[PDB]
Amino acid sequence: QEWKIPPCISNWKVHINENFAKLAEAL
Amino acid sequence: TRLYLKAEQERQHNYLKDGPYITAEEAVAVYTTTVHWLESRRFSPIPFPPLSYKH
Amino acid sequence: QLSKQYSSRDLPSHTKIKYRQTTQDAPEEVRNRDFRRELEERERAAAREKNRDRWDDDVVFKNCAKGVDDQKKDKRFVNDTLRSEFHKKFMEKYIK
Amino acid sequence: EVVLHEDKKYYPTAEEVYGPEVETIVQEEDTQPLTEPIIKPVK
Amino acid sequence: TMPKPQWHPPWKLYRVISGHLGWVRCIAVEPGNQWFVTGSADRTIKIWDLASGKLKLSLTGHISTVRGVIVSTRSPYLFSCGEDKQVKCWDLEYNKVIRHYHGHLSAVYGLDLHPTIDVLVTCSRDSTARIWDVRTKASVHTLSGHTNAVATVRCQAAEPQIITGSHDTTIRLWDLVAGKTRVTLTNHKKSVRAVVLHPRHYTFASGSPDNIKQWKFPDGSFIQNLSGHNAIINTLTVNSDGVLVSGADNGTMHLWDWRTGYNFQRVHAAVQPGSLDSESGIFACAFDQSESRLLTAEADKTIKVYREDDTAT
């Protein structure tokens, strides 16, 4: 079962920092 | 082209992850300085173009 | 069944075999040598060599360039093609 | 604290990963520029 | 075991040399411990000072990945072979190629020199191996036989002069003058990638992903089976001290007592500063002439030098 291989069917063939808050509120 | 766009996507992603590099107090220094300049220069702001504008 | 066809490449060239000579490093010398001693002493010598070798009253900003001593980014070798410092330099140079 | 993308380390120092006992040296370029012979002839 | 047999000192990593841009696939050492050479995907052959580890000389001329490198003992030559198809003879007197041996149909994986006769033996993906007359650049013999790519070939003076193995998992022993097989061993289940001949005993060893077998000479009676470390193993190499080293694609390296299969040490080595964890494992490795240094060629584009630890016990 382990060596079942997903078929390679072809398609051819995010986080953010909180420093932005401190900056923006500062300005 | 492909390399450049790769390192580009890198730099954008690192600018979001690592946050703004300008820090804060620096940015305030810039904004303030510019304010003083435009102050002593009597610069009036540029308004929005009106509907009736002869030019 | 061998063809009478030929080719330019095939023709004689370097028909003589350069045997190693005695000062080049014939096998005779090699058999006799104590490599380990030689290797150690050379190493030691190398090490020794290395050792021998070594107003404006108004501004926004106080000095940014305080402790900024380059950093060993060009001493690091990186086995990753897009994050090698060579690649960065290349990318920097040729795109605008 | 903040690091500009100008620097921003990825990967530890070369030396650190291997440990102190081994010597890690990066040879680039070379020496004994080519007109030199490896194996020098007899005279 | 015989009696908790042959105590050998551990090895430590001594030095790491960067400076290839591709995978280093091959290391050879010069007859006088002066300089050791490396073949790479970079397409260069580099020669390095054994002692200092500084780079002496970069050669260019292969079109594709250099896979195999030999420094002749009795003549001032390199031989190299590549994925290109081309086997070249460099005259180290001028650092240029003087001859080229033409005729394999695909990549040449491997090559070796007869120690006394002056004939060169090469392995290729095209399932043959060739015996080349160095002097005339001539296919003395073509060794048909295996059904897949021949991987590693070794050459010896005595009986079965040519020892070879392939990805079809079977070893053939080739009788040089006939260019025919004397012995077929079929005891590996997966591809044989490496073989090595023991300096004094008149025995030989072969490595596969599954395990490592020693053999009697001639005719390859079975002798032992070293089991332990399971990876696709690319390198087997042996000191006169009976130290057998196994490299592997997963980075691992193990040291063995030739006699007993006692695996005294396991070395798993850090990948290079950049790199990726997956680009680990040693393509090949060798021993200076003094048996005091072990050199490895790694996919992280480095050369590592190991030194036997002096405090040890």
Q: What does E68-122 look like in DSSP terms, one character per residue?
A: EEEE-SSSSEEEEEETTS-EEEEETTTTEEEEEE---SS-EEEEEE-TTT-EEEE
The two tokens of residue E154 are: 């070794």
Query: With DSSP H G I counted as helix, E B as strand and the rest as coil, what are the percentages for chain A, rounded to 5?
Result: 30, 0, 70
- With beta carbons less than 8 A apart as the criterion, state whether E138 and E102 touch: no
Question: Please, is B1 exposed, middle or buried when counting C-beta atoms within 10 Å of its C-beta (0-12, 13-18, 19+)?
Answer: exposed
Contact E182, E202 (CB under 8 A): no
Q: Give Cβ neighbours of residue E209 (< 8 Å, ≥ 6 apart).
A: E190, E191, E230, E231, E232, E233
E301 phi-psi bin (left φ>0, alpha ψ -120 to 50, beta other): left
Cβ–Cβ below 8 Å for D2 and B19: yes
Q: Beta partners for E112? A: E121
Resolution for this experimental structure (Å): 6.5
Count how many residues are written for chain C: 96
HSE-up (13 A, CA, CB side) for residue E198: 19
- The candidate with the shortest Cα–Cα distance to E293, out of E52, E23, E44, is E52
Chain E contact for C28 (CB, 8 A cutoff):
no
Four-CA torsion E251, E252, E255, E261, nearest 10 degrees: -130
E248, E239 Cβ separation under 8 angstroms: no
Nearest Cβ partner of A23 from B17, B18, B27? B27
Query: Which of E283, E275, E197, E213 shows the shortest CA–CA distance to E248?
Result: E283
Q: What is the token pair recorded at E76?
A: 């001032």
Residue B36 · residue D20 · CB < 8 Å = no
Which residue carries 């015996």 as its tokens? E131
Quick count: other Cβ atoms within 10 Å of Cβ C23? 12
CA of C96: which chain B residue's CA is closest?
A: B4
Chain B hits for A20, Cβ within 8 Å: 19-20
With an 8 Å CB cutoff and a minimum of 3 pairs, decide whether chains D and C touch. yes
Contact between E26 and E69 under an 8 Å Cβ cutoff? The reply is: yes
Q: Do D41 and C71 lie within an 8 Å CB cutoff?
A: no
Contact D12, D18 (CB under 8 A): no
The answer to whether D37 contacts chain C (CB < 8 Å) is no
Nearest CB to E274 within list C15, C45, C80: C80
CB contact under 8 A, E75 and C18: yes
C-beta of residue E180 within 8 angstroms of C-beta of residue E174: yes
- Experimental method, per PDB record: cryo-EM
Distance CA E126, CA E94 (A): 32
Q: Sheet with E55-60: list strands edge to edge.
A: E24-29, E35-40, E44-49, E55-60
One-letter amino acid identity for B17? K
Residues 6+ apart with CB under 8 A from E311: none
Do the Cβ atoms of E95 and D38 come within 8 Å?
A: yes
A22, HSE (Cβ side, Cα atoms, 13 Å): 12
By C-alpha distance, the chain D residue nearest E274 is D11
Q: Backbone phi, then psi, for E214, in 5-degree steps?
A: -95, 160
Select from C83, C91, C94 the residue whose CB has the most chain B CBs within 10 Å, as the one to mutate to test that interface: C91
Burial E118-149 (b: 16+ CB within 10 A, else e): ebbbbbbbbbbbbbbebebbebbbebebbeeb
**Chain D residues touching residue B14 (CB < 8 angstroms):** 5, 8
Bridge partners of residue E173, in order along the sequence:
E163, E183
Quickly list DSSP for C23-90.
TTT-HHHHHH--HHHHHHHHHHHHHHHHHHH------S-S-S-SS----GGGT---S-TTTSHHHHHH
